[PDB]
Symmetry: C3
Subunit: 174 residues, 3 copies
């Protein structure tokens, strides 16, 4: 397949994006590292970690710093959820802009390859509360910045992956 | 057009997915059967049944069994909503995993052709309640299993249909 | 690039759709007009107007009439948000069907070119209230009618634009 340094996989909830990333990583022949961002505070979350369940590294908050110091040419890092990392930062009261831009810059310079698995959260109605609105905005921005940084971007819909980067973007004259 | 046994049409709310399926079925020249899953409990729901309004068969709960015993080579079955069928099972307190996997297996062996019309519900924020979270998960899984089972899959966005299966899925080397 | 009269840009929240439309318009060499539909009632909304911030024309309610009387061959009109216009009509208690169909007809006959920027809101769960359900339905219908009316339609996901119109739509035989 096409040789790259960085892939962003975007999909909705229970879209198959994690299975797509996990089977791409398992097919790669690299040393696999799951970068796990989910805080197993309850059994529903441990349940989703168990279902997905490789070297496992927890990175609930320091995702970018973890990528920089775990990435190796011989390793493939899979970020289990960009979304759950952002959630962790938001709930704590952290400003989300700097870590997002820091992560995109990191995505551009790793010592080894990385797949980022991230949710689309922006294609429903406006949330009725400011925390959910901020989260929706920050996740949308984050996916834009990661798509710009990464070599390749795939959208996963109903378990089917479509490549959207590389790809020529449309141009219109008026 | 391309001859197939099974089509999954996925789209958001008021996306045109039902019109796409209905005009494909009307253009087919087969005997048309609407498999209606919507329980007309209120006038908003009867209103949506009336707007869409062929042999009409109600299948509020027993969707797969209804497909197996209504499918014929000369017939095309259209499932008006996978989503409203899942909703019916969820609200009752049914476990959703077995009927979903049963339906995908059914989608693989009918005596005649079928179009499944289903919603994408996974590309908004995490629901604030466990019933809605379960439903979101089950609908995502269901669309994955139906996409795997069906000959063809179309995504309908703003009334425009894009074929995503058949189609080569992307491969990356790292 | 491809010469057209009318483009619909659809995306989720913080998808990059506004940046895609703004940089297409800035690259065009036409006289630029922002058709601004957002009512700056609060600082969050003024904040989003300021971030996006060309001749600026407010059209909170009379969007179609504003397009007809501002469109010129030498001008490109960008509708900053179809979604916030619909929101304005909904909250007031207006019926949304006629203005939507009026706008699609307008999109078909302008004296000059137009880009419509609109949200996808239909790919989450069913809203728990009738106002949000109506809005979701009306926005879905509106995007269908504008996609039918416009020369070209682009979906923007994670800041990446994919053209879906023009494009041959799939056909299946059963």
């Amino acid at each position: 397949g096409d040789p790259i340094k960085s892939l962003l996989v975007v999909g909705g909830a229970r879209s198959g994006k994690s299975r797509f990333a996990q089977r791409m990583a398992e097919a790669s022949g690299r040393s696999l590292v799951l970068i796990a961002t989910a805080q197993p505070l309850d059994a529903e979350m441990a349940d989703r970690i168990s279902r997905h369940a490789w070297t496992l590294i927890e990175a609930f908050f320091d995702l970018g710093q973890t990528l920089r110091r775990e990435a190796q040419p011989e390793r493939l890092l899979v970020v289990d959820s960009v979304t759950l990392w952002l959630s962790n930062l938001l709930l704590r009261g952290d400003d989300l802009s700097p870590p997002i831009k820091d992560l995109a810059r990191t995505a551009a310079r790793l010592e080894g390859p990385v797949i980022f698995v991230s949710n689309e959260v922006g294609a429903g109605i406006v949330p009725d509360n400011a925390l959910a609105r901020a989260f929706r905005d920050a996740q949308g921005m984050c996916n834009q910045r990661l798509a710009e940084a990464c070599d390749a971007v795939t959208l996963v819909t109903a378990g089917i992956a479509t490549q959207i980067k590389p790809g020529p973007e449309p141009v219109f004259r008026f």
